[PDB]
Amino acid sequence: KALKVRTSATFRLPKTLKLARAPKYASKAVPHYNRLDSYKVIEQPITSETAMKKVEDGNILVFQVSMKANKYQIKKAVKELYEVDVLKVNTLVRPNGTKKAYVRLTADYDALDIANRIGYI
Amino acid sequence: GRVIRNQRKGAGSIFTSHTRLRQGAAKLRTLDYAERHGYIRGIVKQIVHDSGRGAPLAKVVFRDPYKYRLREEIFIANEGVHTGQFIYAGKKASLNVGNVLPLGSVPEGTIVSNVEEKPGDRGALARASGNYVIIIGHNPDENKTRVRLPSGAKKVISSDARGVIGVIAGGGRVDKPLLKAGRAFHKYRLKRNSWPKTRGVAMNPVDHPHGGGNHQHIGKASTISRGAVSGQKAGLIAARRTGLLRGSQKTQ
Amino acid sequence: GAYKYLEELQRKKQSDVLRFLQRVRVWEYRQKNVIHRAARPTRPDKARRLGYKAKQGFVIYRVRVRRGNRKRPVPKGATYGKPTNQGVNELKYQRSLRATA
Amino acid sequence: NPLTHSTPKNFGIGQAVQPKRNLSRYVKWPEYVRVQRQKKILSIRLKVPPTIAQFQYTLDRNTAAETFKLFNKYRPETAAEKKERLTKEAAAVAEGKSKQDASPKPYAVKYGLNHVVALIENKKAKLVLIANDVDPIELVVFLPALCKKMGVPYAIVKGKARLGTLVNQKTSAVAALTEVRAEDEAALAKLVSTIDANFADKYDEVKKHWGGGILGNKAQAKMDKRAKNSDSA
RNA sequence: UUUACUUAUUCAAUGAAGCGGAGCUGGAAUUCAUUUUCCACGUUCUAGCAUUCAAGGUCCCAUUCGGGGCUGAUCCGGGUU
RNA sequence: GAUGGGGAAGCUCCGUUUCAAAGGCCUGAUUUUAUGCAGGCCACCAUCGAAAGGGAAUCCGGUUAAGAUUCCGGAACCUGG
């Protein structure tokens, strides 16, 4: 014959058994393959006179890239494809709704070498 | 028949109280164990101008009984208090100006202010600049006390209703003329938007009952009923008499 | 079928046995939410004849509805129609409260 | 004895923090709690009728204990035992060929509220137990009337859960003995006499008694200090 | 026409903390057979300070870094008022 | 401006800290321990709302047909780790 001993003047909900999920089936069919892989990141290079002027001096690749991408994906994708060490990567959305990326390599590598190696000149 | 000025005033769109610069609620401390058994002290830190209330405020700070901290309260400052005067509160507090005693504990002829209407409502009566109540006798059985409100009319209220000792500050506020429209404007723009006031007799008959006519005049009687509805009321409400008085008043 | 006895007891509503229970239950219900799941039917006999068989599937919901007439909405008591359609207080709403509930 | 100084704290309203006390008095319980407690309190406060308050008058823990000793011998079957009987009858239908006379007659308790009623109406019920609860009190209330009318003893026992426990459900509120093995038959009579002394023969007296109108501890105190001490002191 | 009970209803409060009843204990106090009662029942010269299941005292684990219980903070009804 | 709630035949209305059981917090366990567990804690209580209010930190020189306190050169600073 006894009670409990409450000292604070209010009641509160018990921090009960927070039971984790254990569902009898999977949500969807199979894990959706990588939406945004290295090929789906960078689409094309850019051949305009300005771009080449940059390449020949700045050590700077130029790319059209998918919108869903960001500087991290870009600095991954470039390494994964072209076997490079990348510096600073600066992006804009062009007037026509296409993401332009300016990708400077480290001083180790040459741009104009990697430009005609990939194909465009 | 356009909806008249006064009718709009309750809708609450523009007319609501302008309360940016207002310091806080001018309430007493919660009536608890400590205050209704013995007494309890504090210090007053700040006394400060609240805007839209001529009576200056009194920021007082007590120690909470039930935890280690300083919980702050804000009375309407009674005349003759100073920053870092002690302020004693509750049942066995002294009868010195600033303290908040129950109404049974005071004598009769006693001047208090900010007196509660009933036990633990935290301020109610005599809370204006200059005004004050006068406790004018106990009714010790069924513990009430009979008090003199600043209008003149009397009241019977519990002795357990606290009220703070002394007058309220800023007395003789209205002694000065407001002098120029600008000052009036400045006064009112920190209260609400009930200024300036166009006279009903000026505006057109759609706007307000008094309105219209070739000459600026009322035409029907101005004193209207207590029983008259919203929008009819735009005169002298349910007047038991009117015109200029003669003689000494508080007419007992 | 002891339910018959229950039915007869319920039918004697004004008797002190029931208008005693009434006064408890009316308080009890006016303290909970307006709509709320009843655990078990109060008058199971009645429930049973309305087509309820106490097993998994059948759920009972206790609900209140506010009483008396439907006031017509129309702001500041206007109407703008011909004198016939100026009713505000006295109109009464075709479906019963039971329905609303 | 060491250098450890004594320093008492003055809890004198104003100075020092008034520290932890057990405030199981004050604390703000949830709405449901409040509903149940005040339902109880309210039921006590009101002037309750004759036909209710025949309940709350109950069977005490000793005689009741003897009752549960008696009845509990006659629990009905579980899954294991029903399965056993199924096996028995399966065996005996082929070889013995007795038309429903392989196992004995069962002498365990007969129950079910409707069933109980149907027994009482033909006097086939020889004893009937009744729990005080059943929140829809509609159900159980009229049994006292059948029992007193049909010359049957009725025992307002406590806990519908206890009645449940013997009959192997969660609840019951009604358990009755019709048949019984002529062995614990003296104690049966002893009960019948005892039960009838407690509840049954006072039914008419109960018919005049009004329970309730029972004020709370503080209300009672107020009544005492004020209403008693006017002539007395 | 008064006036009483309170559980419905209503209004208010507030991290719904100190309600009522009963006490020790100290004053007034009649005591008439030791009570009948009634008040108190921890803080007012000072703009500081007050928290770590509180120190203290005490009984059990084990005193090997220590740990739990009672009290200190009187009890019962747990109706928050 | 949601939720709790309360209105309204309903479209939806009030209200936003409210008659709610509204939540998270750092520490120990460790070498069954994943985060549960022996604990203490703290009560407010969503959310949106100002490229003129509050706001962590960048400046110079050069460079383009059109860009820069954003690129190149040079020199800094802050933040989290």
XYZ file of N, CA and C in Angstrom, chain B residues 93-240:
444
model
N 3.435 43.334 5.596
C 4.268 44.428 5.116
C 3.929 45.697 5.894
N 4.882 46.624 5.940
C 4.706 47.884 6.662
C 3.824 48.824 5.855
N 3.250 49.804 6.543
C 2.402 50.812 5.923
C 3.254 52.022 5.510
N 4.195 51.773 4.600
C 5.061 52.799 4.021
C 4.791 52.845 2.530
N 5.005 54.015 1.933
C 4.539 54.268 0.570
C 5.338 53.402 -0.395
N 4.619 52.610 -1.187
C 5.224 51.660 -2.115
C 4.829 50.210 -1.889
N 4.423 49.868 -0.668
C 4.170 48.471 -0.297
C 2.778 48.018 -0.671
N 2.624 46.713 -0.860
C 1.368 46.144 -1.362
C 0.733 45.207 -0.316
N -0.157 45.784 0.496
C -0.792 45.073 1.601
C -2.196 44.674 1.210
N -2.684 43.568 1.780
C -4.113 43.289 1.761
C -4.935 44.371 2.470
N -6.190 44.507 2.053
C -7.059 45.595 2.517
C -7.598 45.425 3.944
N -7.585 44.198 4.460
C -7.893 43.950 5.866
C -6.811 44.484 6.788
N -5.557 44.349 6.357
C -4.400 44.748 7.160
C -4.234 46.263 7.342
N -4.722 47.056 6.388
C -4.673 48.519 6.515
C -5.744 49.045 7.474
N -5.545 50.265 8.020
C -6.615 50.934 8.775
C -7.674 51.548 7.844
N -8.535 52.407 8.388
C -9.451 53.215 7.574
C -8.983 54.668 7.537
N -9.321 55.340 6.443
C -8.677 56.584 6.044
C -7.429 56.342 5.201
N -7.114 55.073 4.909
C -5.863 54.717 4.233
C -5.978 54.947 2.742
N -4.910 55.505 2.183
C -4.792 55.768 0.760
C -3.996 54.617 0.136
N -4.639 53.835 -0.739
C -3.928 52.899 -1.626
C -4.325 53.187 -3.065
N -3.641 52.518 -3.984
C -3.923 52.595 -5.411
C -3.753 51.216 -6.022
N -4.069 51.125 -7.311
C -3.881 49.904 -8.083
C -4.639 48.723 -7.472
N -5.668 49.025 -6.686
C -6.353 48.012 -5.899
C -7.108 47.036 -6.805
N -7.040 45.755 -6.461
C -7.705 44.700 -7.217
C -9.209 44.748 -6.965
N -10.002 44.332 -7.949
C -11.455 44.218 -7.760
C -11.833 43.049 -6.870
N -11.098 41.947 -6.989
C -11.310 40.769 -6.146
C -9.977 39.994 -6.054
N -9.915 38.892 -5.271
C -8.587 38.417 -4.842
C -7.696 37.816 -5.945
N -6.604 38.513 -6.254
C -5.588 38.031 -7.186
C -5.896 38.251 -8.657
N -6.424 39.433 -8.992
C -6.630 39.850 -10.400
C -5.510 40.751 -10.946
N -4.580 41.153 -10.073
C -3.344 41.847 -10.453
C -3.617 43.230 -11.069
N -3.998 44.182 -10.220
C -4.375 45.535 -10.648
C -5.769 45.632 -11.252
N -6.499 46.691 -10.895
C -7.828 46.960 -11.466
C -8.266 48.424 -11.326
N -8.344 48.930 -10.093
C -8.886 50.273 -9.820
C -7.817 51.273 -9.422
N -8.100 52.545 -9.691
C -7.212 53.669 -9.355
C -5.834 53.638 -10.036
N -5.739 52.988 -11.197
C -4.459 52.754 -11.883
C -4.033 53.886 -12.821
N -4.751 55.012 -12.795
C -4.421 56.167 -13.635
C -3.430 57.114 -12.954
N -2.836 57.984 -13.763
C -1.912 59.007 -13.284
C -2.591 59.979 -12.321
N -2.149 59.970 -11.065
C -2.686 60.868 -10.044
C -3.770 60.269 -9.157
N -4.617 59.401 -9.712
C -5.770 58.881 -8.971
C -5.386 57.900 -7.890
N -6.322 57.689 -6.971
C -6.104 56.851 -5.800
C -7.419 56.485 -5.124
N -7.415 55.378 -4.378
C -8.574 54.989 -3.559
C -8.338 55.305 -2.087
N -9.432 55.381 -1.340
C -9.386 55.620 0.094
C -10.226 54.543 0.767
N -9.585 53.675 1.549
C -10.316 52.642 2.286
C -11.033 53.355 3.413
N -12.360 53.285 3.418
C -13.172 54.051 4.371
C -14.009 53.148 5.281
N -13.368 52.115 5.819
C -13.974 51.263 6.839
C -14.014 49.802 6.446
N -13.831 48.947 7.446
C -13.933 47.507 7.268
C -15.382 47.060 7.389
N -15.630 45.865 6.869
C -16.844 45.105 7.117
C -16.309 43.723 7.510
N -15.652 43.632 8.691
C -14.797 42.479 9.028
C -15.445 41.085 8.923
N -16.762 41.002 9.127
C -17.513 39.762 8.901
C -17.841 39.617 7.424
N -17.770 38.374 6.944
C -17.591 38.034 5.518
C -16.526 38.910 4.827
N -15.378 39.009 5.498
C -14.245 39.894 5.160
C -14.314 40.699 3.850
N -15.135 41.748 3.873
C -15.104 42.808 2.861
C -14.561 44.105 3.480
N -14.376 45.124 2.641
C -13.958 46.467 3.078
C -14.616 47.499 2.157
N -15.039 48.644 2.706
C -15.753 49.669 1.900
C -14.817 50.816 1.519
N -14.756 51.097 0.219
C -13.679 51.900 -0.368
C -14.214 53.031 -1.229
N -13.403 54.077 -1.366
C -13.766 55.294 -2.084
C -12.984 55.342 -3.400
N -13.689 55.111 -4.509
C -13.102 55.089 -5.855
C -12.995 56.521 -6.373
N -12.113 56.761 -7.358
C -11.809 58.138 -7.783
C -12.941 58.898 -8.480
N -13.913 58.181 -9.047
C -15.157 58.793 -9.523
C -15.892 59.509 -8.395
N -16.021 58.811 -7.274
C -16.834 59.258 -6.154
C -17.616 58.087 -5.608
N -18.161 57.272 -6.514
C -18.972 56.112 -6.138
C -18.193 55.115 -5.282
N -18.934 54.380 -4.457
C -18.368 53.488 -3.449
C -18.311 52.056 -3.957
N -17.665 51.191 -3.183
C -17.610 49.772 -3.511
C -17.325 48.916 -2.284
N -17.771 47.658 -2.350
C -17.512 46.635 -1.326
C -16.753 45.467 -1.964
N -15.543 45.227 -1.467
C -14.613 44.266 -2.063
C -13.895 43.483 -0.972
N -13.391 42.298 -1.318
C -12.705 41.423 -0.354
C -11.505 42.104 0.298
N -11.277 41.788 1.569
C -10.092 42.259 2.280
C -8.823 41.604 1.741
N -8.958 40.403 1.174
C -7.830 39.696 0.549
C -7.381 40.279 -0.803
N -8.171 41.190 -1.371
C -7.738 41.996 -2.513
C -6.610 42.957 -2.115
N -5.414 42.719 -2.653
C -4.272 43.598 -2.421
C -4.391 44.881 -3.208
N -3.687 45.890 -2.716
C -3.573 47.178 -3.386
C -2.372 47.894 -2.820
N -1.740 48.716 -3.646
C -0.437 49.279 -3.296
C -0.589 50.655 -2.633
N 0.247 50.933 -1.637
C 0.092 52.120 -0.788
C 0.556 53.403 -1.499
N -0.247 54.455 -1.356
C 0.085 55.792 -1.829
C -0.760 56.216 -3.004
N -0.542 57.455 -3.426
C -1.042 57.951 -4.711
C -0.287 57.315 -5.870
N -0.747 57.604 -7.078
C 0.006 57.312 -8.282
C 0.663 58.589 -8.823
N 1.834 58.412 -9.433
C 2.649 59.519 -9.949
C 1.969 60.264 -11.088
N 2.616 61.334 -11.541
C 2.144 62.105 -12.686
C 0.837 62.828 -12.433
N 0.529 63.089 -11.161
C -0.656 63.850 -10.793
C -0.525 65.277 -11.302
N -1.663 65.913 -11.560
C -1.690 67.203 -12.230
C -1.120 67.151 -13.637
N -1.376 66.052 -14.352
C -0.991 65.917 -15.761
C -1.852 66.839 -16.597
N -3.156 66.708 -16.403
C -4.138 67.482 -17.148
C -4.267 68.957 -16.725
N -3.488 69.407 -15.742
C -3.502 70.816 -15.323
C -3.017 71.766 -16.416
N -2.054 71.305 -17.207
C -1.501 72.090 -18.303
C -2.466 72.028 -19.467
N -2.582 73.116 -20.246
C -3.303 72.990 -21.507
C -2.455 72.247 -22.509
N -3.122 71.541 -23.405
C -2.443 70.789 -24.446
C -1.969 71.783 -25.516
N -2.654 72.926 -25.593
C -2.128 74.169 -26.173
C -2.218 74.241 -27.698
N -1.505 73.363 -28.406
C -1.568 73.320 -29.875
C -1.916 71.919 -30.378
N -2.733 71.870 -31.436
C -3.221 70.643 -32.057
C -2.134 69.594 -32.153
N -0.916 70.043 -32.443
C 0.222 69.162 -32.645
C 0.483 68.305 -31.429
N 0.469 68.939 -30.262
C 0.698 68.222 -29.015
C -0.367 67.152 -28.807
N -1.618 67.515 -29.088
C -2.727 66.575 -28.974
C -2.532 65.372 -29.880
N -2.124 65.666 -31.108
C -1.838 64.654 -32.121
C -0.783 63.680 -31.605
N 0.285 64.258 -31.053
C 1.401 63.497 -30.519
C 0.980 62.607 -29.365
N 0.092 63.121 -28.527
C -0.484 62.367 -27.416
C -1.263 61.159 -27.951
N -2.102 61.418 -28.957
C -3.044 60.423 -29.416
C -2.447 59.372 -30.316
N -1.460 59.730 -31.135
C -0.826 58.746 -32.026
C -0.026 57.632 -31.332
N 0.146 57.728 -30.016
C 0.695 56.630 -29.223
C -0.383 55.880 -28.433
N -1.657 56.219 -28.670
C -2.794 55.570 -28.027
C -3.557 54.764 -29.073
N -4.218 55.466 -29.989
C -4.957 54.840 -31.088
C -5.304 55.906 -32.143
N -6.263 55.619 -33.026
C -6.666 56.553 -34.068
C -8.096 57.069 -33.832
N -8.329 57.645 -32.650
C -9.604 58.317 -32.328
C -9.402 59.832 -32.211
N -8.642 60.376 -33.154
C -8.351 61.797 -33.202
C -7.807 62.141 -34.597
N -8.180 63.292 -35.151
C -9.206 64.182 -34.625
C -10.585 63.662 -34.958
N -11.595 64.303 -34.381
C -12.976 63.858 -34.503
C -13.816 64.894 -35.252
N -14.292 64.484 -36.428
C -15.235 65.261 -37.220
C -16.569 65.275 -36.499
N -17.244 66.417 -36.487
C -18.547 66.507 -35.842
C -19.618 65.947 -36.743
N -20.479 65.114 -36.166
C -21.564 64.473 -36.898
C -22.450 65.441 -37.655
N -22.711 66.586 -37.041
C -23.555 67.603 -37.646
C -22.964 68.158 -38.959
N -21.651 68.049 -39.136
C -21.008 68.460 -40.379
C -21.218 67.493 -41.528
N -20.976 66.214 -41.258
C -21.040 65.174 -42.298
C -22.455 64.904 -42.841
N -22.528 64.228 -43.987
C -23.793 64.069 -44.720
C -24.636 62.978 -44.057
N -25.964 63.046 -44.196
C -26.935 62.131 -43.566
C -26.711 60.631 -43.706
N -26.058 60.215 -44.789
C -25.614 58.816 -44.932
C -24.599 58.379 -43.880
N -23.806 59.335 -43.422
C -22.651 59.058 -42.603
C -23.002 58.928 -41.131
N -23.968 59.710 -40.658
C -24.177 59.867 -39.224
C -25.509 60.553 -38.936
N -26.210 60.134 -37.869
C -27.601 60.551 -37.726
C -27.811 62.056 -37.662
N -27.058 62.741 -36.806
C -27.098 64.219 -36.733
C -27.002 64.963 -38.081
N -26.311 64.361 -39.046
C -25.980 64.991 -40.321
C -27.032 65.682 -41.168
N -26.517 66.416 -42.151
C -27.317 67.076 -43.164
C -28.015 68.339 -42.726
N -28.994 68.733 -43.543
C -29.765 69.956 -43.352
C -29.106 71.089 -44.094
N -29.829 72.189 -44.242
C -29.250 73.377 -44.855
C -28.325 74.071 -43.874
N -28.758 74.157 -42.620
C -27.911 74.668 -41.547
C -27.318 73.489 -40.773
N -26.176 73.710 -40.130
C -25.552 72.673 -39.309
C -26.270 72.566 -37.966
N -27.237 71.655 -37.915
C -28.056 71.461 -36.726
C -28.593 70.040 -36.652
N -28.987 69.640 -35.442
C -29.363 68.253 -35.175
C -30.789 67.975 -35.612
N -31.756 68.630 -34.972
C -33.158 68.541 -35.384
C -34.046 67.616 -34.577
N -33.571 66.410 -34.307
C -34.227 65.532 -33.345
C -33.499 65.688 -32.026
N -34.102 65.214 -30.941
C -33.460 65.275 -29.624
C -32.143 64.483 -29.599
N -31.134 65.019 -28.908
C -29.776 64.447 -28.917
C -29.570 63.337 -27.884
N -30.234 63.463 -26.740
C -30.209 62.428 -25.718
C -30.949 61.196 -26.220
N -30.255 60.060 -26.284
C -30.847 58.803 -26.794
C -30.883 57.736 -25.716
N -31.696 56.710 -25.951
C -32.006 55.710 -24.930
C -30.859 54.759 -24.628
N -30.910 54.196 -23.427
C -30.124 53.024 -23.086
C -30.579 51.864 -23.978
N -31.887 51.763 -24.209
C -32.456 50.726 -25.074
C -32.302 50.899 -26.583
N -31.748 52.027 -27.031
C -31.528 52.271 -28.463
C -30.320 51.488 -28.970
N -30.416 50.999 -30.199
C -29.474 50.017 -30.712
C -28.199 50.672 -31.262
N -27.265 49.840 -31.732
C -26.039 50.271 -32.423
C -26.300 51.155 -33.630
N -25.740 52.367 -33.607
C -25.898 53.327 -34.697
C -26.936 54.391 -34.412
N -27.975 54.047 -33.647
C -28.840 55.057 -33.031
C -28.028 55.862 -32.010
N -27.226 55.159 -31.206
C -26.378 55.802 -30.193
C -25.302 56.644 -30.840
N -25.512 57.954 -30.780
C -24.563 58.924 -31.291
C -24.899 60.290 -30.723
N -25.031 60.349 -29.405
C -25.428 61.575 -28.728
C -24.942 61.569 -27.297
N -25.862 61.798 -26.363
C -25.579 61.716 -24.936
C -26.352 60.489 -24.460
N -25.637 59.476 -23.984
C -26.225 58.153 -23.833
C -27.051 58.085 -22.571
N -28.344 57.846 -22.757
C -29.272 57.559 -21.674
C -29.144 58.558 -20.526
N -29.088 59.840 -20.879
C -28.804 60.892 -19.910
C -29.953 61.053 -18.925
N -29.641 60.979 -17.637
C -30.639 61.257 -16.619
C -30.887 62.755 -16.458
